[PDB]
Amino acid sequence: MRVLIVKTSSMGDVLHTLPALTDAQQAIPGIKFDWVVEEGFAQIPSWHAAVERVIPVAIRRWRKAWFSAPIKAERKAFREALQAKNYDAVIDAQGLVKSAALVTRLAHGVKHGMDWQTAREPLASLFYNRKHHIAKQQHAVERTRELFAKSLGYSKPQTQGDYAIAQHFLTNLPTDAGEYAVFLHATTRDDKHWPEEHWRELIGLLADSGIRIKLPWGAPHEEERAKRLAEGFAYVEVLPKMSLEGVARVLAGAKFVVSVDTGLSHLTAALDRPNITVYGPTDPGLIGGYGKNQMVCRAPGNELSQLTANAVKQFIEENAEK
Numbered sequence: 001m002r003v004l005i006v007k008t009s010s011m012g013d014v015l016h017t018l019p020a021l022t023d024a025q026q027a028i029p030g031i032k033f034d035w036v037v038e039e040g041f042a043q044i045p046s047w048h049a050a051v052e053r054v055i056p057v058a059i060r061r062w063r064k065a066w067f068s069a070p071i072k073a074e075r076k077a078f079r080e081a082l083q084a085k086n087y088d089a090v091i092d093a094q095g096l097v098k099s100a101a102l103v104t105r106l107a108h109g110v111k112h113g114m115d116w117q118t119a120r121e122p123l124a125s126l127f128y129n130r131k132h133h134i135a136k137q138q139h140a141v142e143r144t145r146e147l148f149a150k151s152l153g154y155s156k157p158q159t160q161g162d163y164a165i166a167q168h169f170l171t172n173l174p175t176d177a178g179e180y181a182v183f184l185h186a187t188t189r190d191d192k193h194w195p196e197e198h199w200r201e202l203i204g205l206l207a208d209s210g211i212r213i214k215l216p217w218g219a220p221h222e223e224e225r226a227k228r229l230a231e232g233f234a235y236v237e238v239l240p241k242m243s244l245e246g247v248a249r250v251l252a253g254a255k256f257v258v259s260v261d262t263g264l265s266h267l268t269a270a271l272d273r274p275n276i277t278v279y280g281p282t283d284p285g286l287i288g289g290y291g292k293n294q295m296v297c298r299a300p301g302n303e304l305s306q307l308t309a310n311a312v313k314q315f316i317e318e319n320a321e322k
């Protein structure tokens with residue numbers, strides 16, 4: 001059986017879809033998935049055993065120079081690749097009008113998606129052949145598992161979702177796996193960042209433990225902050241710039257992670273690595289992670305400026321308890 005998945009945007013949303021592929025694979029041996037996803041996250045689906053062909057899209061990038069000669073070419077290659085196969089099922093796990101009109105609508109096969117009252121954008125429900133009712137009051141990971149279960153004729157396992165992508169890294173874990181912690185400081189908005197000052201204090205509190213700390217960074221200004229956070233700390237290392245897969249191998253070898261509400265935090269949860277995510281303006285109840293050893297840390301008065309290094313270290317300790 002060959003199924004096509006439409007789940008493009010948000011590294012987090014993409015990662016949350018994995019447990020659903022694990023359920024399907026266990027229930028239906030031989031099942032394989034093709035997956036339409038934003039190029040920036042195209043490596044993620046490849047890490048899962050049930051994933052066959054990845055079909056990248058780069059909306060935002062394209063969208064800005066949409067009629068260009070080179071772009072016109074990419075969009076053409078995309079449509080053709082998208083329509084290449086006749087799927088036994090097309091599952092729109094995105095629930096957006098834009099993705100249903102730009103992707104789902106064009107694929108061959110019975111199209112499944114959420115119904116009018118459960119879809120991210122009600123109107124997208126009109127684009128499906130099969131509309132399923134997926135209760136909103138539950139984690140995104142479970143909602144997608146329910147969607148896959150109902151779309152593919154099998155009952156969702158009572159067990160916790162298994163992202164099943166850690167094994168992709170187990171074979172080539174860093175030599176110093178378990179010897180360090182990874183602090184994910186970079187994110188999309190200022191108010192979501194934990195003040196540099198607190199980061200350095202946390203780091204300082206760990207000085208005599210003998211642990212080492214690695215700092216990822218995806219953009220120049222993020223590298224500069226990482227340099228600032230590392231200064232004077234011989235046991236802290238600013239990572240070189242790497243791919244999603246590369247930073248994913250580093251996370252896999254991390255003993256634990258402290259992070260702000262960002263995609264790499266979601267990657268961490270998918271890799272089953274103990275993780276303490278610190279939230280401020282964003283609510284962990286609505287967008288929290290999912291998985292083993294994930295611990296929520298809400299900043300006082302939803303202001304990260306109020307969260308102390310001491311408080312975060314305490315969570316690390318009690319996250320170790322479990």
Ligand SMILES: Nc1ncnc2c1ncn2[C@@H]1O[C@H](COP(=O)(O)OP(=O)(O)O[C@@H]2O[C@H]([C@@H](O)CO)[C@@H](O)[C@H](O)[C@H]2F)[C@@H](O)[C@H]1O
Pocket residue numbers: 010011012186187188189216217218219222242243244245247261262263264266282287288
């Ligand atoms: N290979 C790589 N190595 C090191 N860093 C990498 C990287 N790739 C990306 N980043 C960095 O990761 C961050 C991505 O930004 P983000 O805003 O935190 O992205 P994301 O969409 O993943 O964050 C999500 O943002 C949502 C909203 O706040 C608005 O998008 C939250 O609800 C959700 O929980 C949270 F995960 C950026 O700083 C980016 O440079």
